[PDB]
Structure 1
Amino acid sequence: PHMGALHVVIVGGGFGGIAAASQLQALNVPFMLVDMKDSFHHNVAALRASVETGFAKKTFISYSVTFKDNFRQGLVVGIDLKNQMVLLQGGEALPFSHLILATGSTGPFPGKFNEVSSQQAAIQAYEDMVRQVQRSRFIVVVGGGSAGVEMAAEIKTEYPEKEVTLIHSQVALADKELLPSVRQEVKEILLRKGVQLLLSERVSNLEELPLNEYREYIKVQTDKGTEVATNLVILCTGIKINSSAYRKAFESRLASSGALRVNEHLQVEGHSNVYAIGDCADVRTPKMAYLAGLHANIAVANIVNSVKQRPLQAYKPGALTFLLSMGRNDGVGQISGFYVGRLMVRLTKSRDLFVSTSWKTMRQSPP
């Protein structure tokens, strides 16, 4: 029993979780941030950290340095809604007056990294990836969504002498929600960089392929019988909302996508003190780091507003903002529903990939 006192538990230390923890910390509200890793991952820059020697150490930020005893490393395995408890692997339990679920998404390395690991092992995993790319003259990227087009562009921009093939199962590249003008310009930039495109083809022997590892010879096969020989295979084949921590407890509340249904105040439907933020929230908006941060501000604010019997803040989407870096010198996208060009995207995203914003939030300086 908390007897009216606040204790907020945040499950997930991604873009959403560190924003929520930073604000609760500034408000002196008791809270615990739980993450399976020992450091925040600026995963927007994970593909650049896969091609540039020495960059990976700019993409991982120690939780304990920023949050100290308000941070607990661990894997959440269930939520006990009756006794308001966050269940950790190992048996430990965390009581909460309010729960913020910020579990993000999972997917293949290198675009996502969700291993229980130390900070130096995580950085080394990306430095090893750089070494695999450097050893490999021929490289195949599988999947031409927004991650795969960025991956292929990063490789050919850093290493123009390598041979890069992107294999994609659809006719057009990147997200279907994007303006057709954006999707066509993505294709043209890749072709001008020398990336070979194999569109409307599905790689069919994924079980048989060594992944993220240089080999003298790998044969990639497609459902149409195309065969590509390569030294290296990288999967950018998509992500899944990470519902492990909460799927059982909230099964009745889950969208199809695995997200949690929520109102414009981001409380989970059926609950007044549970919030979902970021990728695991059924925003129906695109899953974006910057939206996770905005959701966190809304979530923390209505926890406080709700204790002050005040009216709640509301999340209202606008047109789609979506920026694709195409290596450090190029890119294309849209800012709230209109096309923005290559100079704009290069300056806004491609050069720095928003890395400095996470170090600022965490109040740390990059090594």
Structure 2
Amino acid sequence: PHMGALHVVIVGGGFGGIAAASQLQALNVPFMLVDMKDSFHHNVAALRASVETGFAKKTFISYSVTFKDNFRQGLVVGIDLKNQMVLLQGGEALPFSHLILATGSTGPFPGKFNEVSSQQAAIQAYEDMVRQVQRSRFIVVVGGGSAGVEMAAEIKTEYPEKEVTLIHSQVALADKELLPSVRQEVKEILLRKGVQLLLSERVSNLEELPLNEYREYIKVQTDKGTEVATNLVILCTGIKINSSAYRKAFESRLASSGALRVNEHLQVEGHSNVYAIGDCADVRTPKMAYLAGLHANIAVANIVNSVKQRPLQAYKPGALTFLLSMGRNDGVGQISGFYVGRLMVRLTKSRDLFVSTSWKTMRQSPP
């Protein structure tokens, strides 16, 4: 029983969650941010952190330094809707008047890092990854979605002398939703960088492969009988909505995606005090970090606007913005539905990978 008082709980400390937490902190609204890690992960830069020595420490930002007693590390195992509690592993419970679900996506390392561990262990996992890439003359990237084409491009840009093969199950690279001109340019850039492309092939012995580790010899097989000898296998095979925290409680209002259905105010269907932001919300746009932060502004604003009996802010998508960095010197993509070239993408994304915007949000300075 909050007896009218606000206490917001944010489940997930990603791009959406740290934006929500930062705004709630500036409004002096009581809240608790929950994340399984001890630091925010700027995962847009996770592939650069897999190939550049010393870079990983720029991609993890301590929660407690920024949020102090408004942060609690923990693993959310469920949501008790009748008694308005967030259920943590270990048995602890967090009461809320409003709930913001910002649980993001899960997938293979290095592109995603969803482990309970300390900031130094997380940084070391990416430094270890860099050392496996450095030891490995021959490298296979599996999956030619937008992550795989970035992974392969990063390796060949930092290490032109390595042999890199990208194996992709479709005939075209990167998102089906992209302008065809963008998808063709991605292909032409990988080929000009010397990446060997095996298109329309599915790697078929994934269970038998050592992953993210150098070996003197690894044989990759595909369903068409192609065999590739390599020293290192990196998986960029896709991601899944991380419905872990809320799956049982909200099974009624889940999309196929695993996301939560929401109106244009980002309240979860059937609720007025539960919001979903970022990857876990069921919007028609693609899963983007910058959209996560914009949903965060909308959700917090609507919590306040609901208390002030004011009209709620509305989320209105426009045409697709999607930028692919192709190593630090190259890239291609589209901004609001039209093509942008390699100089533009290099300057906007490939050089810094938006890293400074997260340190600014967290009001910390990178080491």
* Fold match (TM-score > 0.5): yes
2: CA distance, partners of 1:117 / 1:262 = 32
What secondary structure is seen at the aligned counterpart in 2 of 1:200? coil
Give 1:183 shift.
0.1
What secondary structure is seen at the aligned counterpart in 2 of 1:126? helix
Give 1:284 shift.
1.5
Give 1:96 shift.
0.1
2: CA distance, partners of 1:83 / 1:128 = 44
Give 1:50 shift.
0.1
Q: Are 1:269 and 2:265 matched, yes or no?
A: no
Give 1:290 shift.
0.1
Q: Which 4+ stretches in 1 moved above 4 angstroms?
A: none
1:264-310: CA deviation from partner (whole Å, max 9, x where unpaired): 00000100000000000001210000000000000000000000000
CA RMSD of aligned residues (A): 0.2
The equivalent residue for 1:60 is 60
Give 1:69 shift.
0.1
Query: Any unmatched runs of 5+ in structure 2?
Result: none
2: CA distance, partners of 1:44 / 1:304 = 30
What secondary structure is seen at the aligned counterpart in 1 of 2:21? helix
The equivalent residue for 2:284 is 284
The equivalent residue for 1:41 is 41
1:61-110: CA deviation from partner (whole Å, max 9, x where unpaired): 00000000000000000000000000000000000000000000000000
What secondary structure is seen at the aligned counterpart in 2 of 1:219? strand
1:111-141: CA deviation from partner (whole Å, max 9, x where unpaired): 0000000000000000000000000000000
The equivalent residue for 1:133 is 133
2: CA distance, partners of 1:8 / 1:350 = 36
2: CA distance, partners of 1:113 / 1:261 = 26
1: CA distance, partners of 2:26 / 2:296 = 14
Give 1:344 shift.
0.1
Give 1:332 shift.
0.1
1: CA distance, partners of 2:228 / 2:51 = 22
1:317-346: CA deviation from partner (whole Å, max 9, x where unpaired): 000000000000000000000000000000
2: CA distance, partners of 1:363 / 1:11 = 21
What secondary structure is seen at the aligned counterpart in 2 of 1:324? strand
2: CA distance, partners of 1:298 / 1:69 = 24
What secondary structure is seen at the aligned counterpart in 1 of 2:108? coil
2: CA distance, partners of 1:309 / 1:106 = 37
1:174-225: CA deviation from partner (whole Å, max 9, x where unpaired): 0000000000000000000000000000000000000000000000000000
The equivalent residue for 2:334 is 334
2: CA distance, partners of 1:117 / 1:184 = 40
User: Would you say how many aligned residue pairs link Structure 1 and Structure 2?
Assistant: 367
2: CA distance, partners of 1:72 / 1:60 = 17
1:153-193: CA deviation from partner (whole Å, max 9, x where unpaired): 00000000000000000000000000000000000000000
2: CA distance, partners of 1:342 / 1:111 = 23
Query: Any unmatched runs of 5+ in structure 1?
Result: none
TM-score, structure 1 length as denominator? 1.00
2: CA distance, partners of 1:52 / 1:200 = 30
1: CA distance, partners of 2:28 / 2:53 = 39
What secondary structure is seen at the aligned counterpart in 2 of 1:24? helix
2: CA distance, partners of 1:272 / 1:297 = 16
What secondary structure is seen at the aligned counterpart in 2 of 1:19? helix
What secondary structure is seen at the aligned counterpart in 2 of 1:5? coil
TM-score, structure 2 length as denominator? 1.00
1: CA distance, partners of 2:169 / 2:194 = 20
The equivalent residue for 1:222 is 222
What secondary structure is seen at the aligned counterpart in 1 of 2:160? coil
Identical columns (%): 100
